[PDB]
């Protein structure tokens, strides 16, 4: 009973990823999801960009091929719901 739910990578690409999630019910929709991505190794911080909360898809660009990455989708808040994080090797 947490939002978002079901974080998947729709389309892949060596330098880009297309992902989506289940925003839940209409009362579970939020105003802005902030999404964070970075390297799996952890020798770097984390890149962050927001996206309005009426859209359930997000496109990321500027990745390096072959490297395994970790993607995490947040909420406008964070201490009131639960986030999801996945991995993907381009």
């Amino acid at each position: 009973s947490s939002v978002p739910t079901k974080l998947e990578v729709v389309a892949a690409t060596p330098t880009s990823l297309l992902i989506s999630w289940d925003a839940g019910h209409w009362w579970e929709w939020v105003t802005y999801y902030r999404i964070t991505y970075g390297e799996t190794g952890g020798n770097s911080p984390v890149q962050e960009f927001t996206v309005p909360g009426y859209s359930s898809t997000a496109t990321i660009s500027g990745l390096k091929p072959g490297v395994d990455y970790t993607i995490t989708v947040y909420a406008p808040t964070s201490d009131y719901g639960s986030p999801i994080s996945i991995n993907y090797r381009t």
Binding site: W29, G53, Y54, P76, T77
Partner: protein, 103 residues
């Protein structure tokens, strides 16, 4: 509909304020969008009514109904917190408003 138009703004705002409690700091879509939608309708027709209706009538009606409508809407939608005793203060606050606008 001359004053009923004015009553449309006071009531549209009465609704949007109670929806702002659900907006959760403009972080919950549908109430966050709802409270901005209820206020722009209040904005719209307020400019319409104010063409004929004066001024001290609008605020005095706003205070009274809003102190009554949304407080009775908060007594039903959510409940009550109350961090000080006198409820009659809102009516005397309004009384101080009534005798600075109408008087």
């Amino acid at each position: 509909n001359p004053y009923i138009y004015l009553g449309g703004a006071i009531l549209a705002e009465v609704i949007g304020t109670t929806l702002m409690k659900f907006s959760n700091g403009f972080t919950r879509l549908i109430p966050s969008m709802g409270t901005i939608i209820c206020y722009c309708a209040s904005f719209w027709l307020l400019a319409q009514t104010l063409a004929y209706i004066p001024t001290g009538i609008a605020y005095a009606i706003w205070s009274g109904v809003g102190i009554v409508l949304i407080s009775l809407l908060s007594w039903g939608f959510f409940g009550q917190r109350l961090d000080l005793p006198a409820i009659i203060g809102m009516m005397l606050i309004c009384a101080g408003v009534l005798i600075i606008n109408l008087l």
